[PDB]
Amino acid sequence: GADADTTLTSCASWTQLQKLYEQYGDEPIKKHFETDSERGQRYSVKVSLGSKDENFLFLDYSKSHINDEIKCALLRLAEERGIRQFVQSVFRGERVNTTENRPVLHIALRNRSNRPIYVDGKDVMPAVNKVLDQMRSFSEKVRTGEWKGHTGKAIRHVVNIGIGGSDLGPVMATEALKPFSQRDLSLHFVSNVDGTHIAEVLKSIDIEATLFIVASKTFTTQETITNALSARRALLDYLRSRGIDEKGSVAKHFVALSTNNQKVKEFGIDEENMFQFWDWVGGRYSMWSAIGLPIMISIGYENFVELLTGAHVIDEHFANAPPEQNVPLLLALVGVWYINFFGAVTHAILPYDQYLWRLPAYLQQLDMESNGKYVTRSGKTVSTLTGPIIFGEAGTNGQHAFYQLIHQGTNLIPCDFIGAIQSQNKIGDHHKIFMSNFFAQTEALMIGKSPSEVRRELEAAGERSAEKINALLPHKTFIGGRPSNTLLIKSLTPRALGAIIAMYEHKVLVQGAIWGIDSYDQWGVELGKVLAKSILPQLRPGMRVNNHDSSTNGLINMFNELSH
Amino acid sequence: GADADTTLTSCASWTQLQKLYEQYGDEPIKKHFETDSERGQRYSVKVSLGSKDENFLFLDYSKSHINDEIKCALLRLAEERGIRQFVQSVFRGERVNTTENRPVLHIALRNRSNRPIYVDGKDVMPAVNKVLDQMRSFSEKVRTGEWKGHTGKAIRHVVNIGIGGSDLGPVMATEALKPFSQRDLSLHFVSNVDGTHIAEVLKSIDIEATLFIVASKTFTTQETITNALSARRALLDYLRSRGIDEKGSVAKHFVALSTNNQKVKEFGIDEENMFQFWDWVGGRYSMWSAIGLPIMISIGYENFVELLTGAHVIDEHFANAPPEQNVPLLLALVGVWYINFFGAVTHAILPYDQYLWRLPAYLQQLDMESNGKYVTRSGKTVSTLTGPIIFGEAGTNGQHAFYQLIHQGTNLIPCDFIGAIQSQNKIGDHHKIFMSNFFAQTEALMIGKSPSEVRRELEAAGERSAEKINALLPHKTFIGGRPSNTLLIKSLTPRALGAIIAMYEHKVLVQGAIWGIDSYDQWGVELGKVLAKSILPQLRPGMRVNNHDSSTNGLINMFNELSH
Numbered sequence A, B: 001g002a003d004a005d006t007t008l009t010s011c012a013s014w015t016q017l018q019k020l021y022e023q024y025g026d027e028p029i030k031k032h033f034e035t036d037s038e039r040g041q042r043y044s045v046k047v048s049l050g051s052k053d054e055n056f057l058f059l060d061y062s063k064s065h066i067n068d069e070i071k072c073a074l075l076r077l078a079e080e081r082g083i084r085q086f087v088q089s090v091f092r093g094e095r096v097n098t099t100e101n102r103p104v105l106h107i108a109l110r111n112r113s114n115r116p117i118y119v120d121g122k123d124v125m126p127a128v129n130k131v132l133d134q135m136r137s138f139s140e141k142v143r144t145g146e147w148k149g150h151t152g153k154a155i156r157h158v159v160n161i162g163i164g165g166s167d168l169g170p171v172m173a174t175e176a177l178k179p180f181s182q183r184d185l186s187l188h189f190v191s192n193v194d195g196t197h198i199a200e201v202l203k204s205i206d207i208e209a210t211l212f213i214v215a216s217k218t219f220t221t222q223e224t225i226t227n228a229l230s231a232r233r234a235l236l237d238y239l240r241s242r243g244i245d246e247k248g249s250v251a252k253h254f255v256a257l258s259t260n261n262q263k264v265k266e267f268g269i270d271e272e273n274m275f276q277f278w279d280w281v282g283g284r285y286s287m288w289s290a291i292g293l294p295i296m297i298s299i300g301y302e303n304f305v306e307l308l309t310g311a312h313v314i315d316e317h318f319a320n321a322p323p324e325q326n327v328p329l330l331l332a333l334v335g336v337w338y339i340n341f342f343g344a345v346t347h348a349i350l351p352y353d354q355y356l357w358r359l360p361a362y363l364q365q366l367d368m369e370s371n372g373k374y375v376t377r378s379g380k381t382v383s384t385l386t387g388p389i390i391f392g393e394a395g396t397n398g399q400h401a402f403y404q405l406i407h408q409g410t411n412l413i414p415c416d417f418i419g420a421i422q423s424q425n426k427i428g429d430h431h432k433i434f435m436s437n438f439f440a441q442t443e444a445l446m447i448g449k450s451p452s453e454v455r456r457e458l459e460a461a462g463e464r465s466a467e468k469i470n471a472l473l474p475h476k477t478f479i480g481g482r483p484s485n486t487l488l489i490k491s492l493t494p495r496a497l498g499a500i501i502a503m504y505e506h507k508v509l510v511q512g513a514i515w516g517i518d519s520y521d522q523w524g525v526e527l528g529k530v531l532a533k534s535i536l537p538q539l540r541p542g543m544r545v546n547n548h549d550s551s552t553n554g555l556i557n558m559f560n561e562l563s564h
């Protein structure tokens, strides 16, 4: 391909970090706690959310292979790569998404201060606020029962039709903020083009009382349009079977969240029912825009404003807080330390909150689709590793699933443990039992259990058999020194969720800027789309192909032989 | 710790594989297709499931960096490490789980041939079949409406209470086999000790018509017992609020799936309502046993027998088929090639079937908890990498989520694409549109798009701007040579699911045997449990601690200050 990038590896700070890794990389995490009695406080930052309930976002990054020399060197890397100036460029509307020559302004969607942000010489704030007001008005009509279906019924089911950035945010947020929702409104999500997805939703709803929301930035995504057309056919099929006149039904049951005004009109949706968003709103950064309509319908306008405000508080913290006390910058640098120096290619998101069960899948798109790049903005091949593989499940289910590998496997896996001090559901002693695991797991990963400790524990329990002690000894040994970040909030309120997502959006921004890549494009999805479009007309019963490789030919031919 | 293991790295076959990697590792996958026109057929195996619908399990492992010399060398590794003899030892009941001195007989649970398998000189088959008959009788009473609640109502809600191996199988299988289910029976799963899990289920059920199933091998797991006690308190609280006599209510609403007869009696469950399983049934291999009761209640006895039969067909294939035509052995060897020689520490499970959306989470436990070990059976430290990190989501949602990283990231990620030729839900042209992506993605990962191909595509579309071509060129380039395995079935029937899970169970067996580890124990979960038990009595409002490291002390102290 192109020439190799030297801008990052030639930085004096990068050379120093490589030197510091060779020197201190083998030192166990516990050693840093033994030499610094105030490590927990010195390697942690509390950011107030500015609400009356005194909620906060506390990051503890102390359980890491980072001493003061490494922390200082990581901060110097941030200065050398011009992170401060890059952040200002993003926030002010500069076209940082260089491959598409477009601004990156998801921060404008939640700009509660209404500080003017310009695109093509025009302040975008009145347009942002106009859509938020349109969302308020419509969501209130749905929630109060004012918005009626074709047969006069109030809305009981809300079906979002969209994929990726037009699905994951709405799913994650409605699940995360379920205690703040209106329970009489059932939320359904159709995303997969697999006929099963729309089929199962159609079995679970009363189409007369259903509002379909077609969410798509482009309004041309094959999955979404195919599902939307089937949802429309279903509405018309129901009315026809009951003998009811179908004229004007689509306008009462369908709304659109898009940037493409022309494609929305071709479908048959009223322009009054189109909720606009812009090109500078990336799909994986769109839950704050019109895409957030199903979230607003579920939790209400005031709670949606709280979600936006939480993000805004972290946006202001990120842009203004000093480097050594900046939460998203520190989280990003700890990540760069593990990815580029330790060679850790995986990162676990472990939320100890059942409502946040869809957070790992959301962060998979946010991080992996943003930073899974191998070429820089200048078009040169990267000389370092970029985005890691994100995985995880809600705690404690993970403990009885894959923690065995995190504790005793052959891979170094940085983990983010997210938890809340207060539960929304106070059932007996469930929360303290739950949180005992939250604190214990990070402690366990850090300290481990040495061969000598295992021998003392077995001999203290009364085991006089030297054979059984020696045989079980290595299997019961925990090397420890496994890193983790602990993110603690007072409670998972809409403001708290907004804060958490914005923190991760900004972590991704910093990592992408350090590597010199474009965290805002997605050229990697194009080949699969083009080759699928070429294979589609070849999928007919009995048809034989020979234009692809022998594997693909054999697979398509077998499919055609047995499809029908 | 202990001495380093030399048994694997000293194998002549291992030394040869390292030599073959140095020689052929840089050769692109497409080169093997260009030199062998019959590669698709030669590097694929079709295993019949033995059913009247002519269903099968087809594995295509051709899209890999494997030529005939490497394939032969991988098969020689299997012979040298004694896989054939190890498999016979597992199937015949030998105590292969050396650290716990116990047999590994999940294959006995689905042994439809009723071939005698001995443990302590006694055939286990009559006991296996006795529980299957008990499950048949009870599941039929629940399904027909014969089993009544305390107030005389038929069962409408089935709530499984269990975690890990007592949760993931029941969740995955009931979701996977939803078209074969009895729709009037709503399945709920309480697993997390987070109060939210039981709370949300209690909001969704009619407790008078609810059967609670307490699933736990040991019947002492903190999460499960805490949830079970809250479910019991909920039943008694409801009856008390309505003024109804509670005597004999627990026996009508609670059943247990366990090995511990004593702990089940202490809870208050009738011995007639305890479904037994044994110590040789590992939790992550228990969906075929009594643990499968919620699956049988949902899909019925005949469909559960089909699930068992699918597993049995693959068990027989695995134990008897020649090495070069053995599906789980080949899948395991392709995995070893990528993990130990290419250094690929991640593996993606990408099922193109929405019903299989919980399959990746299931396989995470199966693979990661089994093979995430760093010590051998002999107690020596491994000299090779072991179990990889498993992740994934159902296709096509993954395409618009993280495929950007699989195609254009800095990591080599082996992928397993699983799909069905026939859908259970035939909605318009959804399935062909869906499957066009299935074939295209593996083709895309393999062939890529070279710098020259991108230039030809842009110049053919009419782009005369050399600047735009050169600028977009590297961003639109796909290096290709990304591996994948394609698993194709005729349709996802209960027999097909059984076949797929057994294949993965056996893949895990082979990989663990090659590495010389115990794939059947889980000592790695002990430290987190012990440290949580120590932290639990310290979680009281206002309490201050100083016995842990400064991070854990600071976290517990902050929690205690604001919990109440």
Ligand SMILES: O=C[C@H](O)[C@@H](O)[C@H](O)[C@H](O)COP(=O)(O)O
Residues within 6 Å of the ligand: A163, A164, A165, A166, A215, A216, A217, A218, A219, A220, A221, A224, A282, A283, A284, A285, A365, A369, A522, B400, B401
């Ligand atoms: O940044 C987001 C990604 O590019 C991707 O997840 C995108 O959101 C989907 O491809 C759906 O696109 P539409 O929203 O245009 O349907």
Ligand SMILES: O=C[C@H](O)[C@@H](O)[C@H](O)[C@H](O)COP(=O)(O)O
Residues within 6 Å of the ligand: A400, A401, B163, B164, B165, B166, B215, B216, B217, B218, B219, B220, B221, B224, B282, B283, B284, B285, B365, B369, B522
């Ligand atoms: O092999 C399985 C694992 O050890 C683990 O997932 C186990 O299933 C859970 O710890 C629940 O154990 P019980 O089934 O005993 O509650």
